[PDB]
Design a protein around this ligand. Sequence first.
Ligand SMILES: O=C(c1ccccc1O)c1c(-c2ccc(O)cc2)sc2cc(O)ccc12
Ligand SMILES: O=C(c1ccccc1O)c1c(-c2ccc(O)cc2)sc2cc(O)ccc12
Lengths: 155, 154
Amino acid sequence: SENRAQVAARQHNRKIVEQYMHTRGEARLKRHLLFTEDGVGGLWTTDSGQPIAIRGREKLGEHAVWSLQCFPDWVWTDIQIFETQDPNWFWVECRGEGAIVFPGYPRGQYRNHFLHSFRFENGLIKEQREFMNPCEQFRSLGIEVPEVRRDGLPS
Amino acid sequence: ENRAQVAARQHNRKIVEQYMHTRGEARLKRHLLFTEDGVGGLWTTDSGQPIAIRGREKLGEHAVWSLQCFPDWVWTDIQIFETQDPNWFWVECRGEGAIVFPGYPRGQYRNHFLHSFRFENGLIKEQREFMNPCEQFRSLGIEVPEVRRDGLPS
Ligand SMILES: O=C(c1ccccc1O)c1c(-c2ccc(O)cc2)sc2cc(O)ccc12
Ligand SMILES: O=C(c1ccccc1O)c1c(-c2ccc(O)cc2)sc2cc(O)ccc12
């Protein structure tokens, strides 16, 4: 029963995506338990143009400790979960917001729009990726954002 | 209800595929894939606000500009995602081409993109594209700031 197996996987995986997106506060310290042992998470949109990937359930648990310090009240909001034709692949559109307490920068407030990709293997997350506009993180840190000159562009 | 949803999803998928494969002079007619009041544009920009192109007529005018400033643009590595909403699709892809912006040196622009497509009565009501603007800055020779990482776990 291929269809029955796919339906069951999609239903379970959706529950894991929901749980991930609703994980807040001290529960963030256990969010890595939603991943496979070799699971990868992280931020795919950065100033360098390369992802910052956090590799392995153990490193993901270590990152959570840092995350609670530097984003102490972070929440995802406006959460819209998208199932796909692949029962093991979901997308989420949402916003996120919270204080940002990055080392060596003034404390700030960070808001952004996010897309998340979740790929599953055997009931847990194998790959999580988040995509945002880094310009908004720059603004939250007081970093000057470059501006494309629009004089010559239609408007 | 289910027959209607299946029919919508199958037709809408063909439109997404056509959009993503549209290149060259055919870009001048891509706006015909939209409703009269359809919206398209770039949701990730330096200002933090979208640059939305409102209405099928304005979309057709934007295509003319697009063919001048992105004269050979191609979408590659296209992955189309249907969803539980037969009228909502997402696409993960890359894009590449020359960038010829007014008052900047000619460059080569490459980026990773996500696209959202929402449909109404067989045509695109809302198209949005999401990318990392730092790569467009680099293509234009604009300096990209660097978040200092010394204090961050490595
Ligand atoms: O915000 C993050 C981040 C990274 C990965 C996962 C979640 C995040 O929020 C970040 C960096 C970072 C690197 C190492 C580390 O241990 C903690 C954070 S560097 C950097 C540069 C940018 O332009 C924009 C964001 C960032
Ligand atoms: O590239 C675009 C663009 C905008 C909308 C749809 C497709 C696009 O590719 C663009 C701008 C633009 C504005 C008016 C116009 O008529 C033509 C282009 S300004 C700007 C500033 C940024 O930081 C990054 C990108 C851009």
